[PDB]
């Protein structure tokens, strides 16, 4: 009977942090979490050192060492970390479907835009940062107009090599 965090919303929300939207194709890949803390749901991941592991640290990704994919919302995750994949757990990375993610940009994004990754934190945006600290995920595009700090769905394809931007 818990009425806390009641906002009396006009209508239903759109999605959650890492939920997918149904479509026939999806590469979902099982990896093992390597970071000491968990990994959030809609997040980018790099290639681990365990030959099948992944890390949440993408500060050193390059066109030669591209990022691995994006985690998905699992909803059965050990109930000790709130919404995360705990250490030593199947990660369920996705690299082909359409997924809801979080926007980090001042002016927001619109339907068809490039997707730029900020290597410092691992956040998605519309344009390059400008100090050799951003990559462009070459095969990727948005699918929703959204403001700053809101959820937008994007279409992703990680087999296309990334592009470095200074």
């Amino acid at each position: 009977m818990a009425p806390y965090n009641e906002t009396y919303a006009s209508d239903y929300a759109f999605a959650y942090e890492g939920m997918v939207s149904d479509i026939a194709p999806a590469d979902i890949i099982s990896r093992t979490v390597e970071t000491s803390a968990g990994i959030g749901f809609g997040k980018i991941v790099a290639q681990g050192t365990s030959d099948r592991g992944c890390k949440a640290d993408v500060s050193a990704v390059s066109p030669t060492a591209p990022p691995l994919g994006i985690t998905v919302r699992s909803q059965a995750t050990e109930n000790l970390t709130l919404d995360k994949y705990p250490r030593y757990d199947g990660a369920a990375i996705m690299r082909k479907g359409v997924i809801w993610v979080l926007v980090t940009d001042a002016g927001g994004v619109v339907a068809g835009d490039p997707v730029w990754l900020k290597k410092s934190d691992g956040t998605f945006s519309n344009a390059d940062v400008g100090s050799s600290g951003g990559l462009r995920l070459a095969g990727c595009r948005w699918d929703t107009s959204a403001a700053n700090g809101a959820l937008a769905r994007m279409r992703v394809d990680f087999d296309v090599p990334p592009v470095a931007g200074a």
Partner: protein, 300 residues
């Protein structure tokens, strides 16, 4: 070998009906580790309790109510359970070509899948993955590992061999305040065999392996022989790649291994002239609850 499902045989030849499979080291976990599979499927953790009590007994009188009382206390611990899987797939005309030869491809891919499942369970039990931090019996970092007293067991007299072997049992007996005795001992393969065939002295009749079978702490006072078993992966498990031997008590209250789900086959899904059967099994890691009743000795 070859992979064609078809062989050219003569008409005056006899085709012996015997399936000879390749040889692999034996399974060797059943009977060396206690495994209990009784948890409901798709659990996520496993909980277990303890219990300890305190009291005292005094002298009373015909009226003085000096009667003392007792007290109780409990503590809880937990472990986890993970998921893995392996399965097979096949084409359409492949299975139909194997059916008119009496091969039964769907049933011949299940035998080997069970076999590789047992292989996986063995590897998880006797060593670690470093993907789930499933510390194994041979590399658990919570037990004490000491070195042998200058014993290489090659060009070593049986005095040194006996001293080194009794070092493990005398070092575990005093480590539990003289309460528990070693039950089983696992030695590297290379050195279980050097000790298996040499005499105690220049003139003797028994081997140094047959001597420590009995004539130890465990076997004489309670009456059963000590299980000196020869092991396979202990050849270089050690501090600097040197052989390790393990002494332990082998009870369900020392070791445990939880396998909620054994191995499952799910329905077949057909995608364009290809059939894909996925197989899943859900198991946890090895648990050493009493680390003071397991001892590592290196350098034998």
């Amino acid at each position: 070998m070859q992979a064609n499902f078809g062989f050219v045989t003569s008409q005056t030849a006899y085709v012996e009906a015997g399936v000879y499979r390749m040889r692999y080291p034996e399974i060797r976990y059943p009977g060396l580790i206690p495994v209990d599979y009784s948890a409901p499927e798709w659990i996520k953790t496993v909980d277990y309790y303890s219990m300890d009590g305190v009291g005292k007994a005094e002298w009373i009188a015909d009226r003085a109510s000096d009667i003392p009382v007792v007290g109780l206390a409990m503590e809880k611990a937990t472990t986890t359970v993970h998921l893995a899987g392996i399965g097979y797939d096949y084409g359409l005309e492949e299975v139909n070509q194997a059916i008119m030869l009496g091969m039964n491809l769907p049933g011949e891919k299940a035998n080997l899948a069970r076999l590789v499942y047992e292989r996986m369970v063995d590897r998880v039990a006797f060593t670690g993955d470093a993907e789930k931090d499933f510390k194994g019996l041979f590399n658990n970092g919570a037990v004490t590992a000491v070195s042998a007293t200058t014993g290489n067991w090659a060009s070593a007299t049986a005095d040194q061999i006996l001293a080194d072997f009794n070092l493990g049992i005398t070092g575990l007996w005093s480590a539990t305040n003289e309460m528990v005795y070693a039950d089983t001992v696992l030695l590297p393969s290379a050195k279980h065999q050097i000790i298996a065939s040499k005499r105690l002295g220049n003139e003797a009749t028994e081997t140094v392996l047959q001597f420590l079978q009995r004539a130890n702490v465990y076997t004489a006072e309670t009456g059963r022989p000590l299980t000196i078993r020869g092991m396979r992966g202990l050849n270089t498990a050690g501090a600097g790649g040197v052989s390790r031997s393990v002494f332990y008590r082998n009870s369900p209250e020392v070791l445990k291994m939880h396998i909620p789900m054994r191995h499952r086959f799910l329905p077949v899904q057909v995608v364009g002239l290809t059939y894909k059967v996925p197989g899943i099994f859900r198991l946890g890691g090895l648990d050493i609850r009493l680390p003071k009743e397991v001892r590592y000795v290196d350098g034998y």
